[PDB]
Ligand binder design. Structure first.
Ligand SMILES: Cc1ccc(C(=O)Nc2cccc(C(F)(F)F)c2)cc1Nc1nc(-c2cccnc2)nc2nn(C)cc12
Length: 262
């Protein structure tokens, strides 16, 4: 992770609260480059030397990722206090709230483009053996061009989690695929809560009955079928991320196939 001199950083508003400190919007103005907006995670005060380490481990993990659909680490501030992790700032914020605010205002092909971007980011993570464990629309940021970037904001996410990961903590890329299917439903439903206001126990019960979420209004049948593929109880039968990307690319190539609705 690139070390950023704190003199190049300005904090403009606190937008959240993490496990070790704050989340802020700010500005980064490095000597040679233009000034950009950044999101900042902070860690300050009387943290143990361990907590600092645990805090900075996140930046070491993120620094491995370079993909257009994965949030981009700008760098870290570690030679001064507060300790900080900086990423790019995404104009449209989190995907779930973005879609709820803009309910019905995107075409199927636009939504499929978002889903394809998310799937490509996940294919990249799976290829380097990184299991996300909390893939959900709330963890996906949207830029001004509608590009979706997988992120992880930390925290119980029962309703996005594959049954084997709930029961036995077996988290794999295949359980991420289950979560991806939920994200597909969130997107095509313009940010409805998975399983509505069913309790967590109601959700586990429904899945055990072999129930699966229905096609959202106006959702092409082929997209809902791909959701059903992601939600197979047998994790080995779920498509892998490259197969998901290929399936979405076929729909983009053959848009008439997106006209078939329930
Ligand atoms: C500063 C920061 C630090 C870490 C991450 C983050 O996504 N880390 C992470 C960790 C493990 C795995 C992954 C990945 F795999 F990429 F998903 C990402 C994101 C950010 N950027 C953030 N941006 C934003 C944000 C909000 C509105 C508009 N643009 C950005 N909100 C954030 N909340 N939190 C907790 C972090 C936020």
């Amino acid at each position: 992770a690139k070390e950023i001199d704190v003199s190049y950083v300005k904090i403009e508003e606190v937008i959240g609260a993490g496990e070790f400190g704050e989340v802020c919007r700010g500005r980064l103005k490095a000597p040679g480059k233009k000034e950009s907006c950044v999101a900042i995670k902070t860690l300050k005060g009387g943290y143990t030397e361990r907590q600092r380490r645990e805090f900075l481990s996140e930046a070491s993990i993120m620094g491995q990722f370079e993909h257009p659909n994965i949030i981009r680490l700008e760098g870290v501030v570690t030679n001064s206090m507060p300790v900080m992790i900086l990423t790019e700032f995404m104009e449209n914020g989190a995907l779930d709230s973005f879609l709820r605010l803009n309910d019905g205002q995107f075409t199927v092909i636009q939504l499929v483009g978002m889903l394809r971007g998310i799937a490509s980011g996940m294919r990249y993570l799976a290829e380097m053996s990184y299991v996300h464990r909390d893939l959900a629309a709330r963890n996906i940021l949207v830029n001004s061009n509608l590009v979706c970037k997988v992120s992880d904001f930390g925290l119980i996410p029962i309703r996005w989690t594959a049954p084997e990961a709930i029961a036995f903590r077996k988290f794999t890329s295949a359980s991420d695929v289950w979560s991806y299917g939920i994200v597909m439903w969130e997107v095509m439903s313009f940010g409805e809560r998975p399983y509505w206001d069913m309790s967590n126990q109601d959700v586990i019960n429904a899945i055990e009955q072999d129930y699966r979420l229905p096609p959202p209004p106006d959702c092409p049948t082929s997209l809902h079928q791909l959701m059903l593929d992601c939600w197979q109880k047998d994790r080995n039968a779920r498509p892998r991320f490259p197969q998901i990307v290929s399936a979405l690319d076929k729909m983009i190539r053959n848009p008439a196939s997106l006209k078939i609705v329930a």
